[PDB]
Amino acid sequence: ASLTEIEHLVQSVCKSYRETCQLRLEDLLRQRSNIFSREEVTGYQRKSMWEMWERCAHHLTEAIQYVVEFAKRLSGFMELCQNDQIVLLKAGAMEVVLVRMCRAYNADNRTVFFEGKYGGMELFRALGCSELISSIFDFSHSLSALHFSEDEIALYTALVLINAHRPGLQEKRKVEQLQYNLELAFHHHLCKTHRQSILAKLPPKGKLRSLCSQHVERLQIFQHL
Ligand SMILES: COc1nc2ccc([C@](O)(c3ccc(C(F)(F)F)nc3)c3cncn3C)cc2c(Cl)c1-c1ccc(S(C)(=O)=O)cc1
């Protein structure tokens, strides 16, 4: 577990992420000027819940595909048994997607980028999931308030996926080794960038599971009526 090896792993994970980040940050930031008009918003609000459901499910599906690309590029992930590979992804894919979403959230006006423009939470009114969506904005907002960086997201989400405590793992010790290495990389880098203070400010991991389990419950309902 050399120092050079540790720095190599950091750069690897950050490369893997930059290659699967789906939307470039500079594009997202540039678009913050572009906001949905009152009419446009009303457009989304008139759609049935099932319309918005199909739209968001496709958005979610395409996102999770990028998280799969990312995981497959994490050192040592592909060398796992196919069982553990599926366990980890089914258990952490949604969570990763949710963390990535803070890149699309603008904390200055509480708006999220969605299909070409930024819009508030009223945008997703049709779903009737105001409770949950408000929770998604709050999570993004707190991460956005920390000025979460691309590399930080890459290393955090790598740790979300590679969880040796996931029920159903067969080669558990094999993942434990992966988890340790990544955690060493994540903390070494926070220090190199003088950002280790965010660790106390980070939302608890349980809340990441609590917000996704609430979220994953709705998906089971919306399919298929
Ligand atoms: C807050 O609500 C949401 N906001 C979203 C914001 C963006 C996107 C996004 O897909 C996107 C953008 C950037 C990134 C990046 F950060 F990775 F780059 N990933 C993904 C997108 C938008 N326009 C183009 N794209 C690609 C999807 C969102 C979704 Cl799906 C929800 C949502 C989730 C669950 C429920 S529900 C059924 O559970 O109630 C309802 C709604």
PDB file of C-alpha atoms and ligand atoms in Angstrom:
ATOM      1  CA  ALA A   1       0.000   0.000   0.000  1.00  0.00           C
ATOM      2  CA  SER A   2       2.557   2.568  -1.171  1.00  0.00           C
ATOM      3  CA  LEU A   3       2.120   6.337  -1.338  1.00  0.00           C
ATOM      4  CA  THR A   4       2.573   6.336  -5.107  1.00  0.00           C
ATOM      5  CA  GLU A   5       0.047   3.502  -5.384  1.00  0.00           C
ATOM      6  CA  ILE A   6      -2.414   5.512  -3.283  1.00  0.00           C
ATOM      7  CA  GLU A   7      -2.053   8.568  -5.508  1.00  0.00           C
ATOM      8  CA  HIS A   8      -2.415   6.363  -8.594  1.00  0.00           C
ATOM      9  CA  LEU A   9      -5.712   5.019  -7.274  1.00  0.00           C
ATOM     10  CA  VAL A  10      -6.999   8.536  -6.652  1.00  0.00           C
ATOM     11  CA  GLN A  11      -6.190   9.573 -10.206  1.00  0.00           C
ATOM     12  CA  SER A  12      -7.698   6.351 -11.524  1.00  0.00           C
ATOM     13  CA  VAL A  13     -11.040   6.846  -9.762  1.00  0.00           C
ATOM     14  CA  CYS A  14     -11.181  10.502 -10.834  1.00  0.00           C
ATOM     15  CA  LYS A  15     -10.431   9.554 -14.432  1.00  0.00           C
ATOM     16  CA  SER A  16     -13.072   6.823 -14.352  1.00  0.00           C
ATOM     17  CA  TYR A  17     -15.587   9.340 -13.059  1.00  0.00           C
ATOM     18  CA  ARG A  18     -14.727  12.119 -15.514  1.00  0.00           C
ATOM     19  CA  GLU A  19     -15.251   9.551 -18.262  1.00  0.00           C
ATOM     20  CA  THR A  20     -18.714   8.584 -16.986  1.00  0.00           C
ATOM     21  CA  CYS A  21     -20.000  11.842 -15.533  1.00  0.00           C
ATOM     22  CA  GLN A  22     -22.790  11.918 -18.135  1.00  0.00           C
ATOM     23  CA  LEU A  23     -23.005  15.726 -18.155  1.00  0.00           C
ATOM     24  CA  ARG A  24     -19.979  18.014 -18.117  1.00  0.00           C
ATOM     25  CA  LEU A  25     -19.909  20.430 -15.193  1.00  0.00           C
ATOM     26  CA  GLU A  26     -19.065  23.454 -17.354  1.00  0.00           C
ATOM     27  CA  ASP A  27     -22.160  22.751 -19.444  1.00  0.00           C
ATOM     28  CA  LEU A  28     -24.352  22.569 -16.339  1.00  0.00           C
ATOM     29  CA  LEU A  29     -22.870  25.791 -14.966  1.00  0.00           C
ATOM     30  CA  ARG A  30     -23.252  27.624 -18.276  1.00  0.00           C
ATOM     31  CA  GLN A  31     -26.943  26.733 -18.417  1.00  0.00           C
ATOM     32  CA  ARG A  32     -27.751  28.143 -14.966  1.00  0.00           C
ATOM     33  CA  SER A  33     -28.691  31.318 -16.842  1.00  0.00           C
ATOM     34  CA  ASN A  34     -31.337  29.348 -18.738  1.00  0.00           C
ATOM     35  CA  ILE A  35     -34.475  29.030 -16.602  1.00  0.00           C
ATOM     36  CA  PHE A  36     -37.965  27.668 -17.321  1.00  0.00           C
ATOM     37  CA  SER A  37     -40.604  30.332 -17.898  1.00  0.00           C
ATOM     38  CA  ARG A  38     -43.833  30.249 -15.900  1.00  0.00           C
ATOM     39  CA  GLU A  39     -45.590  28.853 -18.967  1.00  0.00           C
ATOM     40  CA  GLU A  40     -42.999  26.128 -19.564  1.00  0.00           C
ATOM     41  CA  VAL A  41     -43.253  25.038 -15.937  1.00  0.00           C
ATOM     42  CA  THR A  42     -47.040  24.895 -16.164  1.00  0.00           C
ATOM     43  CA  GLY A  43     -46.424  22.644 -19.148  1.00  0.00           C
ATOM     44  CA  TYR A  44     -44.803  19.986 -16.973  1.00  0.00           C
ATOM     45  CA  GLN A  45     -47.415  20.475 -14.257  1.00  0.00           C
ATOM     46  CA  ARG A  46     -50.287  19.592 -16.595  1.00  0.00           C
ATOM     47  CA  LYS A  47     -48.797  16.233 -17.561  1.00  0.00           C
ATOM     48  CA  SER A  48     -50.257  13.195 -15.810  1.00  0.00           C
ATOM     49  CA  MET A  49     -48.169  11.569 -13.092  1.00  0.00           C
ATOM     50  CA  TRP A  50     -47.571   8.635 -15.438  1.00  0.00           C
ATOM     51  CA  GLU A  51     -46.184  10.933 -18.117  1.00  0.00           C
ATOM     52  CA  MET A  52     -43.686  12.454 -15.689  1.00  0.00           C
ATOM     53  CA  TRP A  53     -43.065   8.938 -14.375  1.00  0.00           C
ATOM     54  CA  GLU A  54     -42.046   7.609 -17.796  1.00  0.00           C
ATOM     55  CA  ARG A  55     -39.874  10.694 -18.330  1.00  0.00           C
ATOM     56  CA  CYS A  56     -38.083  10.393 -15.003  1.00  0.00           C
ATOM     57  CA  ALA A  57     -37.721   6.615 -15.237  1.00  0.00           C
ATOM     58  CA  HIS A  58     -35.912   7.030 -18.563  1.00  0.00           C
ATOM     59  CA  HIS A  59     -33.754   9.739 -17.000  1.00  0.00           C
ATOM     60  CA  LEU A  60     -33.016   7.428 -14.066  1.00  0.00           C
ATOM     61  CA  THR A  61     -32.363   4.458 -16.332  1.00  0.00           C
ATOM     62  CA  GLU A  62     -29.882   6.370 -18.475  1.00  0.00           C
ATOM     63  CA  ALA A  63     -28.161   7.670 -15.339  1.00  0.00           C
ATOM     64  CA  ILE A  64     -27.752   4.256 -13.715  1.00  0.00           C
ATOM     65  CA  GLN A  65     -26.156   3.078 -16.960  1.00  0.00           C
ATOM     66  CA  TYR A  66     -23.405   5.655 -16.450  1.00  0.00           C
ATOM     67  CA  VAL A  67     -22.889   4.436 -12.886  1.00  0.00           C
ATOM     68  CA  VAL A  68     -22.445   0.941 -14.302  1.00  0.00           C
ATOM     69  CA  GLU A  69     -19.766   2.217 -16.674  1.00  0.00           C
ATOM     70  CA  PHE A  70     -18.082   3.910 -13.717  1.00  0.00           C
ATOM     71  CA  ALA A  71     -18.152   0.833 -11.483  1.00  0.00           C
ATOM     72  CA  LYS A  72     -16.750  -1.346 -14.256  1.00  0.00           C
ATOM     73  CA  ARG A  73     -13.787   1.026 -14.435  1.00  0.00           C
ATOM     74  CA  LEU A  74     -13.021   0.995 -10.721  1.00  0.00           C
ATOM     75  CA  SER A  75      -9.826  -0.984 -10.179  1.00  0.00           C
ATOM     76  CA  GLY A  76     -10.603  -4.516  -9.026  1.00  0.00           C
ATOM     77  CA  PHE A  77     -14.368  -4.300  -9.484  1.00  0.00           C
ATOM     78  CA  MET A  78     -14.502  -6.442 -12.632  1.00  0.00           C
ATOM     79  CA  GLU A  79     -12.321  -9.090 -10.986  1.00  0.00           C
ATOM     80  CA  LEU A  80     -15.114  -9.822  -8.511  1.00  0.00           C
ATOM     81  CA  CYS A  81     -17.562 -12.697  -8.776  1.00  0.00           C
ATOM     82  CA  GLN A  82     -20.596 -11.730 -10.860  1.00  0.00           C
ATOM     83  CA  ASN A  83     -22.754 -12.185  -7.763  1.00  0.00           C
ATOM     84  CA  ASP A  84     -20.951  -9.511  -5.746  1.00  0.00           C
ATOM     85  CA  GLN A  85     -20.837  -7.217  -8.771  1.00  0.00           C
ATOM     86  CA  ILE A  86     -24.635  -7.335  -8.990  1.00  0.00           C
ATOM     87  CA  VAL A  87     -25.072  -7.079  -5.217  1.00  0.00           C
ATOM     88  CA  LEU A  88     -23.000  -3.891  -5.057  1.00  0.00           C
ATOM     89  CA  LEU A  89     -24.723  -2.220  -8.010  1.00  0.00           C
ATOM     90  CA  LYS A  90     -28.306  -3.080  -7.062  1.00  0.00           C
ATOM     91  CA  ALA A  91     -27.467  -1.861  -3.563  1.00  0.00           C
ATOM     92  CA  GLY A  92     -25.647   1.333  -4.470  1.00  0.00           C
ATOM     93  CA  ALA A  93     -26.489   2.422  -8.014  1.00  0.00           C
ATOM     94  CA  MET A  94     -29.439   4.620  -6.999  1.00  0.00           C
ATOM     95  CA  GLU A  95     -27.434   6.175  -4.162  1.00  0.00           C
ATOM     96  CA  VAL A  96     -24.620   7.123  -6.550  1.00  0.00           C
ATOM     97  CA  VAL A  97     -27.079   8.635  -9.017  1.00  0.00           C
ATOM     98  CA  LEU A  98     -28.512  10.696  -6.182  1.00  0.00           C
ATOM     99  CA  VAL A  99     -25.087  12.002  -5.154  1.00  0.00           C
ATOM    100  CA  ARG A 100     -24.255  12.888  -8.758  1.00  0.00           C
ATOM    101  CA  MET A 101     -27.452  14.947  -8.947  1.00  0.00           C
ATOM    102  CA  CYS A 102     -26.024  17.778  -6.827  1.00  0.00           C
ATOM    103  CA  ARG A 103     -24.025  18.785  -9.908  1.00  0.00           C
ATOM    104  CA  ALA A 104     -27.313  19.769 -11.525  1.00  0.00           C
ATOM    105  CA  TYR A 105     -28.585  21.681  -8.486  1.00  0.00           C
ATOM    106  CA  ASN A 106     -28.148  25.446  -8.245  1.00  0.00           C
ATOM    107  CA  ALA A 107     -28.198  26.445  -4.577  1.00  0.00           C
ATOM    108  CA  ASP A 108     -28.569  30.162  -5.318  1.00  0.00           C
ATOM    109  CA  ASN A 109     -32.133  29.798  -6.612  1.00  0.00           C
ATOM    110  CA  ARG A 110     -33.000  26.256  -5.489  1.00  0.00           C
ATOM    111  CA  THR A 111     -33.394  25.004  -9.054  1.00  0.00           C
ATOM    112  CA  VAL A 112     -32.376  21.785 -10.785  1.00  0.00           C
ATOM    113  CA  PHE A 113     -31.389  21.298 -14.411  1.00  0.00           C
ATOM    114  CA  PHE A 114     -33.998  19.225 -16.222  1.00  0.00           C
ATOM    115  CA  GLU A 115     -34.405  18.547 -19.947  1.00  0.00           C
ATOM    116  CA  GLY A 116     -32.725  21.699 -21.220  1.00  0.00           C
ATOM    117  CA  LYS A 117     -33.336  24.216 -18.437  1.00  0.00           C
ATOM    118  CA  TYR A 118     -33.280  24.908 -14.707  1.00  0.00           C
ATOM    119  CA  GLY A 119     -36.516  24.700 -12.730  1.00  0.00           C
ATOM    120  CA  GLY A 120     -37.699  24.625  -9.129  1.00  0.00           C
ATOM    121  CA  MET A 121     -39.324  21.663  -7.419  1.00  0.00           C
ATOM    122  CA  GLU A 122     -42.776  22.827  -8.595  1.00  0.00           C
ATOM    123  CA  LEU A 123     -41.600  21.359 -11.892  1.00  0.00           C
ATOM    124  CA  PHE A 124     -42.235  17.821 -10.635  1.00  0.00           C
ATOM    125  CA  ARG A 125     -45.606  18.711  -9.122  1.00  0.00           C
ATOM    126  CA  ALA A 126     -47.535  16.171 -11.200  1.00  0.00           C
ATOM    127  CA  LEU A 127     -45.914  13.190  -9.447  1.00  0.00           C
ATOM    128  CA  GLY A 128     -47.535  14.166  -6.140  1.00  0.00           C
ATOM    129  CA  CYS A 129     -44.214  13.261  -4.512  1.00  0.00           C
ATOM    130  CA  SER A 130     -43.599  16.754  -3.121  1.00  0.00           C
ATOM    131  CA  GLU A 131     -42.403  15.259   0.175  1.00  0.00           C
ATOM    132  CA  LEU A 132     -39.716  13.153  -1.497  1.00  0.00           C
ATOM    133  CA  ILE A 133     -38.630  15.699  -4.113  1.00  0.00           C
ATOM    134  CA  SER A 134     -38.208  18.287  -1.384  1.00  0.00           C
ATOM    135  CA  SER A 135     -35.921  15.769   0.303  1.00  0.00           C
ATOM    136  CA  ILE A 136     -33.905  15.392  -2.902  1.00  0.00           C
ATOM    137  CA  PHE A 137     -33.435  19.168  -3.190  1.00  0.00           C
ATOM    138  CA  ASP A 138     -32.341  19.391   0.453  1.00  0.00           C
ATOM    139  CA  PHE A 139     -29.734  16.663  -0.007  1.00  0.00           C
ATOM    140  CA  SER A 140     -28.369  18.287  -3.160  1.00  0.00           C
ATOM    141  CA  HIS A 141     -28.450  21.690  -1.495  1.00  0.00           C
ATOM    142  CA  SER A 142     -26.353  20.641   1.488  1.00  0.00           C
ATOM    143  CA  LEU A 143     -23.779  19.023  -0.797  1.00  0.00           C
ATOM    144  CA  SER A 144     -23.821  22.069  -3.073  1.00  0.00           C
ATOM    145  CA  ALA A 145     -23.274  24.267  -0.011  1.00  0.00           C
ATOM    146  CA  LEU A 146     -20.067  22.342   0.706  1.00  0.00           C
ATOM    147  CA  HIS A 147     -18.806  23.190  -2.777  1.00  0.00           C
ATOM    148  CA  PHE A 148     -18.473  19.464  -3.492  1.00  0.00           C
ATOM    149  CA  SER A 149     -15.818  19.003  -6.176  1.00  0.00           C
ATOM    150  CA  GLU A 150     -15.747  16.581  -9.130  1.00  0.00           C
ATOM    151  CA  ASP A 151     -12.900  14.577  -7.574  1.00  0.00           C
ATOM    152  CA  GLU A 152     -14.691  14.492  -4.214  1.00  0.00           C
ATOM    153  CA  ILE A 153     -17.836  13.126  -5.865  1.00  0.00           C
ATOM    154  CA  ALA A 154     -15.753  10.522  -7.696  1.00  0.00           C
ATOM    155  CA  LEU A 155     -14.106   9.236  -4.523  1.00  0.00           C
ATOM    156  CA  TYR A 156     -17.222   9.401  -2.349  1.00  0.00           C
ATOM    157  CA  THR A 157     -19.422   7.520  -4.821  1.00  0.00           C
ATOM    158  CA  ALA A 158     -16.683   4.934  -5.302  1.00  0.00           C
ATOM    159  CA  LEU A 159     -17.081   4.334  -1.564  1.00  0.00           C
ATOM    160  CA  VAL A 160     -20.867   4.224  -1.855  1.00  0.00           C
ATOM    161  CA  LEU A 161     -20.672   1.380  -4.382  1.00  0.00           C
ATOM    162  CA  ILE A 162     -17.808  -0.595  -2.864  1.00  0.00           C
ATOM    163  CA  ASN A 163     -19.496  -1.459   0.427  1.00  0.00           C
ATOM    164  CA  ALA A 164     -18.335  -4.741   1.952  1.00  0.00           C
ATOM    165  CA  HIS A 165     -21.294  -4.621   4.352  1.00  0.00           C
ATOM    166  CA  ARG A 166     -23.858  -5.260   1.623  1.00  0.00           C
ATOM    167  CA  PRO A 167     -26.039  -8.317   2.330  1.00  0.00           C
ATOM    168  CA  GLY A 168     -25.431 -11.122  -0.163  1.00  0.00           C
ATOM    169  CA  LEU A 169     -21.702 -10.752  -0.754  1.00  0.00           C
ATOM    170  CA  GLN A 170     -19.822 -14.025  -1.212  1.00  0.00           C
ATOM    171  CA  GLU A 171     -16.229 -12.806  -1.528  1.00  0.00           C
ATOM    172  CA  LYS A 172     -16.621 -10.289   1.307  1.00  0.00           C
ATOM    173  CA  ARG A 173     -12.955 -10.047   2.341  1.00  0.00           C
ATOM    174  CA  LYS A 174     -12.133  -9.374  -1.309  1.00  0.00           C
ATOM    175  CA  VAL A 175     -14.351  -6.294  -1.239  1.00  0.00           C
ATOM    176  CA  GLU A 176     -13.141  -5.244   2.213  1.00  0.00           C
ATOM    177  CA  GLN A 177      -9.711  -4.880   0.637  1.00  0.00           C
ATOM    178  CA  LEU A 178     -11.171  -2.697  -2.120  1.00  0.00           C
ATOM    179  CA  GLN A 179     -13.059  -0.602   0.422  1.00  0.00           C
ATOM    180  CA  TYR A 180      -9.982  -0.022   2.590  1.00  0.00           C
ATOM    181  CA  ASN A 181      -7.842   1.044  -0.360  1.00  0.00           C
ATOM    182  CA  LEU A 182     -10.451   3.520  -1.619  1.00  0.00           C
ATOM    183  CA  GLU A 183     -11.028   4.954   1.856  1.00  0.00           C
ATOM    184  CA  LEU A 184      -7.291   5.532   2.193  1.00  0.00           C
ATOM    185  CA  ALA A 185      -7.301   7.248  -1.194  1.00  0.00           C
ATOM    186  CA  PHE A 186     -10.327   9.394  -0.337  1.00  0.00           C
ATOM    187  CA  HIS A 187      -8.863  10.690   2.934  1.00  0.00           C
ATOM    188  CA  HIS A 188      -5.332  11.157   1.601  1.00  0.00           C
ATOM    189  CA  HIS A 189      -6.779  13.333  -1.159  1.00  0.00           C
ATOM    190  CA  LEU A 190      -9.047  15.391   1.100  1.00  0.00           C
ATOM    191  CA  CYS A 191      -5.868  16.244   3.002  1.00  0.00           C
ATOM    192  CA  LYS A 192      -3.810  17.055  -0.094  1.00  0.00           C
ATOM    193  CA  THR A 193      -6.560  19.525  -1.033  1.00  0.00           C
ATOM    194  CA  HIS A 194      -7.074  20.698   2.556  1.00  0.00           C
ATOM    195  CA  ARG A 195     -10.733  19.648   2.538  1.00  0.00           C
ATOM    196  CA  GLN A 196     -10.826  17.030   5.290  1.00  0.00           C
ATOM    197  CA  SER A 197     -13.200  19.294   7.232  1.00  0.00           C
ATOM    198  CA  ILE A 198     -16.188  18.411   5.012  1.00  0.00           C
ATOM    199  CA  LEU A 199     -16.265  14.966   6.654  1.00  0.00           C
ATOM    200  CA  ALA A 200     -18.013  16.315   9.756  1.00  0.00           C
ATOM    201  CA  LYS A 201     -20.400  18.333   7.583  1.00  0.00           C
ATOM    202  CA  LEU A 202     -21.324  15.444   5.297  1.00  0.00           C
ATOM    203  CA  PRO A 203     -24.869  14.066   5.601  1.00  0.00           C
ATOM    204  CA  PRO A 204     -24.911  10.708   7.465  1.00  0.00           C
ATOM    205  CA  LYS A 205     -24.653   7.603   5.277  1.00  0.00           C
ATOM    206  CA  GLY A 206     -27.873   6.208   6.726  1.00  0.00           C
ATOM    207  CA  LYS A 207     -29.721   9.240   5.385  1.00  0.00           C
ATOM    208  CA  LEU A 208     -28.355   8.334   1.952  1.00  0.00           C
ATOM    209  CA  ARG A 209     -29.937   4.904   2.341  1.00  0.00           C
ATOM    210  CA  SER A 210     -33.031   6.325   4.052  1.00  0.00           C
ATOM    211  CA  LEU A 211     -33.678   8.757   1.206  1.00  0.00           C
ATOM    212  CA  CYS A 212     -33.135   6.104  -1.465  1.00  0.00           C
ATOM    213  CA  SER A 213     -35.242   3.429   0.232  1.00  0.00           C
ATOM    214  CA  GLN A 214     -38.035   5.998   0.396  1.00  0.00           C
ATOM    215  CA  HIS A 215     -37.261   6.721  -3.248  1.00  0.00           C
ATOM    216  CA  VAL A 216     -36.993   3.087  -4.376  1.00  0.00           C
ATOM    217  CA  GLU A 217     -40.339   2.334  -2.711  1.00  0.00           C
ATOM    218  CA  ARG A 218     -42.084   4.745  -5.083  1.00  0.00           C
ATOM    219  CA  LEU A 219     -40.560   3.083  -8.153  1.00  0.00           C
ATOM    220  CA  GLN A 220     -42.070  -0.240  -7.082  1.00  0.00           C
ATOM    221  CA  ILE A 221     -45.477   1.445  -6.932  1.00  0.00           C
ATOM    222  CA  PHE A 222     -45.298   3.273 -10.275  1.00  0.00           C
ATOM    223  CA  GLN A 223     -44.683  -0.024 -12.089  1.00  0.00           C
ATOM    224  CA  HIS A 224     -46.813  -1.217 -13.510  1.00  0.00           C
ATOM    225  CA  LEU A 225     -50.369   0.074 -13.134  1.00  0.00           C
TER     226      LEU A 225
HETATM  227  C1  LIG B   1     -35.020  16.215  -8.439  1.00  0.00           C
HETATM  228  O1  LIG B   1     -35.803  15.279  -9.171  1.00  0.00           O
HETATM  229  C2  LIG B   1     -35.057  14.864 -10.260  1.00  0.00           C
HETATM  230  N1  LIG B   1     -34.138  15.693 -10.752  1.00  0.00           N
HETATM  231  C3  LIG B   1     -33.423  15.295 -11.803  1.00  0.00           C
HETATM  232  C4  LIG B   1     -32.474  16.146 -12.306  1.00  0.00           C
HETATM  233  C5  LIG B   1     -31.708  15.791 -13.387  1.00  0.00           C
HETATM  234  C6  LIG B   1     -31.886  14.569 -13.985  1.00  0.00           C
HETATM  235  C7  LIG B   1     -31.035  14.209 -15.154  1.00  0.00           C
HETATM  236  O2  LIG B   1     -31.353  12.886 -15.550  1.00  0.00           O
HETATM  237  C8  LIG B   1     -29.593  14.245 -14.768  1.00  0.00           C
HETATM  238  C9  LIG B   1     -28.859  15.398 -14.912  1.00  0.00           C
HETATM  239  C10 LIG B   1     -27.534  15.406 -14.549  1.00  0.00           C
HETATM  240  C11 LIG B   1     -26.979  14.252 -14.048  1.00  0.00           C
HETATM  241  C12 LIG B   1     -25.542  14.258 -13.652  1.00  0.00           C
HETATM  242  F1  LIG B   1     -25.322  14.960 -12.508  1.00  0.00           F
HETATM  243  F2  LIG B   1     -25.042  13.012 -13.435  1.00  0.00           F
HETATM  244  F3  LIG B   1     -24.739  14.823 -14.595  1.00  0.00           F
HETATM  245  N2  LIG B   1     -27.668  13.119 -13.897  1.00  0.00           N
HETATM  246  C13 LIG B   1     -28.954  13.140 -14.259  1.00  0.00           C
HETATM  247  C14 LIG B   1     -31.295  15.066 -16.324  1.00  0.00           C
HETATM  248  C15 LIG B   1     -32.163  16.115 -16.534  1.00  0.00           C
HETATM  249  N3  LIG B   1     -32.050  16.616 -17.804  1.00  0.00           N
HETATM  250  C16 LIG B   1     -31.120  15.881 -18.368  1.00  0.00           C
HETATM  251  N4  LIG B   1     -30.639  14.935 -17.514  1.00  0.00           N
HETATM  252  C17 LIG B   1     -29.610  13.969 -17.830  1.00  0.00           C
HETATM  253  C18 LIG B   1     -32.838  13.706 -13.490  1.00  0.00           C
HETATM  254  C19 LIG B   1     -33.605  14.071 -12.405  1.00  0.00           C
HETATM  255  C20 LIG B   1     -34.566  13.239 -11.872  1.00  0.00           C
HETATM  256 CL1  LIG B   1     -34.825  11.693 -12.584  1.00  0.00          CL
HETATM  257  C21 LIG B   1     -35.317  13.619 -10.783  1.00  0.00           C
HETATM  258  C22 LIG B   1     -36.314  12.770 -10.178  1.00  0.00           C
HETATM  259  C23 LIG B   1     -35.892  11.635  -9.526  1.00  0.00           C
HETATM  260  C24 LIG B   1     -36.799  10.798  -8.924  1.00  0.00           C
HETATM  261  C25 LIG B   1     -38.132  11.113  -8.985  1.00  0.00           C
HETATM  262  S1  LIG B   1     -39.307  10.035  -8.205  1.00  0.00           S
HETATM  263  C26 LIG B   1     -40.019   9.177  -9.580  1.00  0.00           C
HETATM  264  O3  LIG B   1     -38.539   9.087  -7.424  1.00  0.00           O
HETATM  265  O4  LIG B   1     -40.329  10.875  -7.613  1.00  0.00           O
HETATM  266  C27 LIG B   1     -38.573  12.239  -9.632  1.00  0.00           C
HETATM  267  C28 LIG B   1     -37.655  13.072 -10.231  1.00  0.00           C
END
